[PDB]
Design a protein around this ligand. Structure first.
Ligand SMILES: [Zn+2]
Ligand SMILES: [Zn+2]
Ligand SMILES: [Zn+2]
Lengths: 187, 52, 168, 48
């Protein structure tokens, strides 16, 4: 394994996945062709626990399997499952999630700035900006409601408004320093 | 790239390397994100002074 | 076996009292007051019982141990677990450290985050060696978006079409 | 087989082993999205 593929495969398995997925990968890095019974005696895991961890890597298009049908000394059919780190698919799978994780923040932010900005703190009614021509009272200079005469306020300060947008927009820029060590190596 | 600053959005250069940047007449550099974000909020005013 | 289980029990229990020296077979039957067992039963358990044991150790004229082959040392838990990573020999369970090393709750907590823990269904822990040369960790909400991307119900050649459509 | 559909492959050229896996409901959803207008008239359906 090259120095770029070995360093990239170790940083992803630690931060993203759990600890059980990283302990079963260190043996696959030092040794490629590893038998199925070797990862159970060295790691001291369980038959049902190790199978659930290996299925998560195989399901994520990371490693494959090469079955063998031969004959042992006793005369029975012996089947093995050789698991090795296959870099012929893992390269595009990592880049596939990076495009959706980057667009998920942009979609949730674009679909949150355009909503509303008026709410009555009495009747708890979420109003919009397209009803200011009918909810205005010229005898007082302020806004009112429909079925009652109460004063409205904002709309629960939590959405990216004129000033709160900078706080939520800079959260996306924090992904660059935490991933620059992993993106520059793959680039 | 990111050392010159950014007007309104401020979070655009770190999202796409191949970003479409534009220029004006007074002497500034505004990307394509600040063009649509400022039009829906105001119009075509200079973020530092007053250039229509 | 019942007789073999009694010899191994007394061989290890007496060592933890304050005796650090190899023992044989006549010493056990004399200290435990079990010498009157016969001559046919003493010779039968000498050249067959202690010989069939695959983990037995014979230094010269006595007998050593079998659950632990390393000598006692203070700074030895970190050095022993480090050899399993640089060579690939496997790992050591928690029941092996608590049995051979008395009071293991002090040396493990003193090292800090140098040894990773494994949660087994049968309530067992596995002691490994956390490599400090490669460390990476993110927030809790960052790991949720990584697993939310459905990549199991797709295809290998299908991913290449989506990446070449955007530009990467 | 009740409420779960299965699949059995048999390629007598390079994979003689009969593969048996459960058909995930997300697999048939990605294929139906690719069906265009010219392909719905064959089955007897109208996209509109
Ligand atoms: Zn009201
Ligand atoms: Zn901008
Ligand atoms: Zn100016």
């Amino acid at each position: 394994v090259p120095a770029a593929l070995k360093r990239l495969a170790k940083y992803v398995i630690r931060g993203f996945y759990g600890i059980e997925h990283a302990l079963a990968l260190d043996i696959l890095i030092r040794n490629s062709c590893v038998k199925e019974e070797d990862m159970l005696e060295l790691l001291k895991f369980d038959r049902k626990q190790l199978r659930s961890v290996l299925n998560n890597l195989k399901g994520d298009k990371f490693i494959k399997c090469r079955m063998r049908v031969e004959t042992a000394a006793d005369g029975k059919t012996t089947r093995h499952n050789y698991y090795f780190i296959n870099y012929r698919t893992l390269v595009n799978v990592v880049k596939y999630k990076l495009d959706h994780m980057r667009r998920r923040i942009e979609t949730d932010e674009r679909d949150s700035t355009n909503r509303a900005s008026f709410k009555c703190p009495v009747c708890s009614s979420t109003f919009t900006d397209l009803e200011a021509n009918q909810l205005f009272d010229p005898m007082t200079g302020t806004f009112r409601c429909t079925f009652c005469h109460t004063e409205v306020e904002e709309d629960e300060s939590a959405m990216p408004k004129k000033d709160a947008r900078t706080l939520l927009a800079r959260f996306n820029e924090q992904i660059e320093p935490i991933y620059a060590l992993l993106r520059e190596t793959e680039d | 790239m990111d050392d010159q600053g950014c007007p309104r959005c401020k979070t655009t250069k770190y999202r796409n390397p191949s970003l479409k940047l534009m220029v004006n007449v007074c002497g500034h550099t505004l990307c394509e994100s600040c063009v649509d974000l400022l039009f829906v909020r105001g119009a075509g005013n200079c973020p530092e002074c007053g250039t229509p | 076996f019942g007789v073999l289980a009694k010899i191994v029990n007394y061989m290890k229990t007496r060592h933890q009292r304050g005796d650090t020296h190899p023992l044989t077979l006549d010493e056990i039957l004399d200290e435990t007051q079990h010498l009157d067992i016969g001559l046919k039963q003493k010779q039968w358990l000498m050249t067959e019982a202690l010989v069939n044991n695959p983990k037995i150790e014979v230094i010269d004229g006595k007998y050593a141990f079998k659950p632990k082959y390393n000598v006692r040392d203070k700074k030895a838990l970190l050095r022993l677990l480090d050899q399993h990573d640089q060579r690939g020999l496997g790992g050591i369970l928690l029941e092996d450290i608590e049995e051979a090393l008395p009071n293991s709750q002090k040396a493990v907590k003193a090292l800090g985050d140098q040894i990773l823990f494994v949660n087994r269904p049968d309530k067992k822990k596995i002691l490994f060696f956390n490599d400090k040369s490669c460390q990476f960790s993110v927030d809790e909400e960052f790991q949720k978006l990584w697993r939310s991307v459905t990549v199991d119900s797709m295809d290998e050649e299908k991913i290449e079409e989506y990446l070449k459509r955007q530009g990467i | 087989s009740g409420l779960e559909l299965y699949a059995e492959w048999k390629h007598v050229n390079e994979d003689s082993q009969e593969k048996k896996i459960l058909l995930s409901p997300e697999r048939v959803h990605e294929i139906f999205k690719r069906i265009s207008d010219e392909e719905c008239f064959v089955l007897g359906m109208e996209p509109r």
